[PDB]
């Protein structure tokens, strides 16, 4: 039982540790998005 | 008075002219504003 409770605390620190690495993309991607949306208007602002 | 009506239809063909000159600048115009608007999208997360 001990053994299960450790393997469950495991598998709760994994999925703690997917949660931070979905956050921690979702904060990486909108950084790289807003220079992206910066270019992507300067490129649309030459065509009009 | 059929002097008055030459004069003023030369002055409506040249107006139509004016109009239909206007029309083809203006649809050439569109036709820019169409493939700017292309472009944007292509250019457009969201």
Redesign the interface.
């Known amino acids: 039982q001990r053994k299960r409770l450790a393997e469950k605390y495991r598998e709760c620190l994994s999925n703690k540790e997917k949660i931070l690495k979905e956050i921690e993309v979702k904060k990486e ?1 909108l950084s790289s ?1 807003q220079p992206r949306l910066n270019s ?2 300067q ?2 602002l030459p ?2």
């Open positions: 991607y998005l992507i208007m490129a649309s065509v009009q």
